[PDB]
């Protein structure tokens, strides 16, 4: 329950000073208005139909209006701070997933992280903000019918506020009393029930003996003594509130005996006693959710501490310094063990495997398993376990993160379209570094000025939600585009080719070739004809490589590779 | 929503007219304390003298005790009301279940029932018995209240209910404008959270680009435009309360400025404004109770039709009438074919078992599907679809149900027994009939003589739920005994053995073989020893016999009975 994020909100600690003081001036409104009755019957009808009488409709009014701009600048200045606060704590809360790893958007909560964390944020605002909206003008309100408790009818008063914990120990210990009573009785009740049931369970037997009448008898005696039984707990239960209304009554015929003695002389005066009564009751509704405070902060503070747990979550290792601008060295492979989390089978066994600079090299698998991911060891969504990927001599470990990810590119169909323009989506954080031609450029050689000249704004247009959702066909060539406008050294596909396009697939691989044309090439192709131009190839077996060689070698000797080339088809 | 239900109140509306004298009675009571309200302000406080002031805390407490006896009259009566009816209907509905065919018991209402004839039937006593509580009660006290206000004052009552509806459809609209606009809001809320899942969606992609800051101005971006349109919707609805309150505070101050502003009243002498305010607001909650009248009404009424169909529901078929008292002749089975309601598979397909008077046939094979269906249809649990099921030359649709029920037995380990005295138990129906010394004969073959006289009070002892729980080979002990005591010409036996006691199941089959003195039996064998004692073999496929004759003769044609020896030895 101890909090921190008072520094969030110190910045924006005059909005809720600025709440505060409209809230305290609420509650002096509704106090006033309840102080109103004294003259709505002292000077109220009884004397001159004039003066004071004339007044206060006048003022009520103004003081409902006066209330009204509380109500609205109160409510303006707490959400003037609730939201700073829901946008600032999200905004920092965003800033920690980008350096944090993929593992627990790996099926932890991958559309549910959202939905819970902008929901119990909202939560957290909304529950804190509303327990200072209620502690203060709950709160100030309950001091204001106090105080006028004390300003008419002072002894009055004290009797009135002592008699409300006598009638509280007395509704309470009555209704506890008769409700273990009715306890009692729904237990007897149970039993006469659990008589009742087996009569009828052996239907069975009693229609072959034919005891229907004996039957018909023996549950005319159950059914009267469950009657008699329901019978007593609604007597019970129905004395019940007479007597609690009988203490409370009691309760007041001792207020109204109060005017018998002199120790309330003058206190009676007017029709003030309404005043005196009225604020009692309208005391009732604050007061009872003031217990519930600590009902809303804690639940707030909860919440908050599942999102802070999030806050403090370890973000991704940073153990690299290394910068590289284009590895022209080899990836490579060695003895390399890594386990998928929560996995204990191997999602990769000890593997060798070398990438020569300028070269390809292809995995092939009908489940897919192990090749899937490989390729996101050198892009490092997932920590180096077990092994040595010395890409250029050196670990992913020694390496910088980010020069990593700038060395690597990764297209596939599942290519995630930013909302920003099509022009800004493939210069995507490199805006400022290149050049708008350049874009065009790489816009023709992955063929994909065909589609934007089709488009009605051009090159600077939207594309998915709040967009146009173009085909996927046309993202993989904005990929495309992507990898040879950052020109890594490292390219990664999948090409997983659902359906071929006629010459818009065709072109899409004409611009592979052209990404393949340099750079080092990673593939997990399941096209054919990807397979057939494949440098080398690395066949896997689920968690390991069964066969390494050229697709050519391994159709020679049938192997692995050979039965899956012939069941692909 | 029609009913007719009243012959089932008539003899009962004597408690329905005393309830309803007693909660008007209650309302009035209601009513005059309200009325008492008026000296309390007009001359109970102002004015010095209090003798007039202390009489009326005696008229309080004493109209209170009134109340009180006025509630628990109440509560009585309806209490009486609604158990008779719960009662007799329970009553008529359980006559009426002891003639439903088993299909009605097959499963389509087996715990259900239990609720249907329990919680259904309280829940159509109980909302009929609220609904008339409501309508007389809550109705009275409206006119109570109508014609206090009417009496104190002709024309502040006129005014105030001429401004209630006004009130009411100012309120309305404004609610319902200020909803549609929050609406407005909540799509554009739900537009940007669009945005907000979208732009989280690609971390993957983010990572591997590295465009982590761009990122994080472009959700700073879109939370400014979500807090933007937070602030926007919690405005709008924060701008209602104000505007209903400004309303309301309205109609008050019409209400008091026309009322005080010339003569029209004339007659606001005192805090009689407080009584004909009060009294509206207390007004407020029976004509809120009043609109679900017909929402309990319908509820309850609902509850009886469900109940209602079961009970009016078409029993078993009666139609046969010929009438036997001892059977000698030999029932027998003709191309009969029966289904289960259900499954379209023939549960007996057209079969001619012919049984033997005095020879025990014995039905063969492991089956599950259809095992006890050929003993079901002896005492006709279920119609019999097709061909002639022949007792002593007549079918089981011409002769009597009750007569048929008479003449056969049904032994099983699967046995209800009564809650009643195991003297009862043994003579269920028969009590009359056979005498007790009969009754402990039947002991003494049946061998339960060793375990009833070990029961403390001997054969005149509950013995089933809410008592001994005698184990169930006790009580096929007590079923071979009322096999004995009925000796009916024929007997089915379902022989689940599952464990053999020692000396103790050997005793139960020399009571088997006291039975198989005579009176034919079909028996279900799942014994050896019984297989091999029995006359006749007629093995099932499940729908259909498999064989047709004697142990030894299935030894020497092995068809289906050798491999139930396989799992015999």
């Not at 800004?424 to 954080?429: D, F, G, L, Q, R």
Request: net charge neutral.
């Amino acid at each position: 329950t101890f909090r921190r994020l008072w520094p969030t909100i110190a910045p924006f600690k005059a909005g809720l000073i600025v709440a505060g003081v409209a809230l305290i001036l609420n509650a002096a409104s509704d106090t006033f208005m309840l102080s109103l009755l004294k003259p709505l019957l002292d000077d109220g009808f009884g004397k001159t139909d004039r003066s004071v009488l004339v007044w206060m409709p006048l003022v009520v009014i103004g003081l409902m209006i006066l209330r009204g701009i509380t109500s609205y600048v109160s409510s303006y200045c707490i959400s003037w701070v609730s939201g700073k606060v829901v946008m600032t704590m999200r905004r920092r809360l965003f800033g920690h997933m980008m350096g944090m790893p993929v593992s627990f958007f790996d099926k932890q909560s991958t559309g549910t992280l959202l939905s819970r964390i902008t929901y119990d944020s909202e939560q957290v605002a909304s529950s804190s903000s509303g327990a200072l909206i209620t502690v203060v003008r709950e709160g100030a309100s309950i001091i204001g019918l106090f105080i006028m408790m004390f300003y008419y009818s002072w002894q009055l008063s004290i009797i009135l506020i002592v008699l409300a914990p006598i009638v509280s120990i007395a509704i309470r210990v009555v209704s506890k009393r008769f409700r273990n009573i009715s306890k009692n009785m729904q237990n007897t009740m149970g039993q006469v029930t659990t008589s009742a049931e087996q009569m009828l369970k052996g239907h069975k037997e009693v229609l072959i003996f034919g005891g229907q009448e004996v039957e018909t008898k023996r549950f005319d005696k159950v059914s009267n003594r469950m009657r008699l039984q329901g019978m007593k707990m609604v007597s019970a239960s129905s004395i019940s509130d007479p007597i609690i209304q009988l203490i409370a009554s009691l309760a007041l015929a001792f207020v109204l005996y109060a005017a018998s003695f002199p120790s309330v002389m003058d206190s009676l005066t007017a029709g003030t006693i309404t005043v005196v009564f009225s604020s009692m009751i309208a005391l009732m509704r604050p007061l009872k959710s003031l217990t519930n405070v600590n009902a809303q902060f804690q639940r707030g503070m909860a919440a908050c501490q599942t999102l802070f747990t999030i806050l403090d979550s370890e973000q991704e290792k940073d153990e690299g310094k290394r910068v590289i601008e284009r590895a022209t060295g080899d990836v490579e492979f060695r003895n390399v063990t890594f386990t998928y989390p929560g996995r204990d089978v191997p999602a990769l066994r000890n593997i060798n495997l070398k990438i020569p600079a300028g070269k390809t090299v292809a995995l092939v698998g009908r489940s897919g398993s192990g090749k899937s991911t490989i390729a996101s060891l050198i892009t490092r969504f997932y920590d180096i376990d077990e092994g040595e990927i010395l890409m250029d001599g050196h670990d992913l470990r020694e390496y910088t993160l980010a020069s990593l990810r700038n060395q690597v590119a990764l297209v596939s169909q599942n290519v995630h379209l930013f909302n920003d323009t099509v022009a800004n989506n493939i210069a995507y954080a490199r805006t400022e570094q290149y050049s708008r031609e350049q874009i065009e450029e790489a816009a023709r050689m992955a063929y994909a000025m065909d589609f934007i000249n089709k488009m009605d704004n051009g090159l600077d247009t939207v594309i998915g939600e709040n967009g146009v959702l173009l085909s996927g066909g046309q993202r993989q060539r904005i990929a495309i585009a992507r990898a040879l406008l950052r020109d890594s050294p490292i390219l990664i596909l999948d090409e997983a080719t659902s359906a071929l396009d006629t010459e818009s697939e065709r072109a899409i691989q004409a611009a592979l070739d052209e990404l393949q044309k340099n750079r080092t090439s990673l593939v997990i192709a399941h096209r054919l004809s990807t397979i057939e131009k494949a440098d080398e190839i690395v066949v896997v077996e689920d968690g390991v490589i069964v066969e390494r060689g050229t697709h050519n070698d391994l159709l020679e000797h049938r192997g692995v590779y050979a039965q899956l080339h012939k069941m692909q088809f």
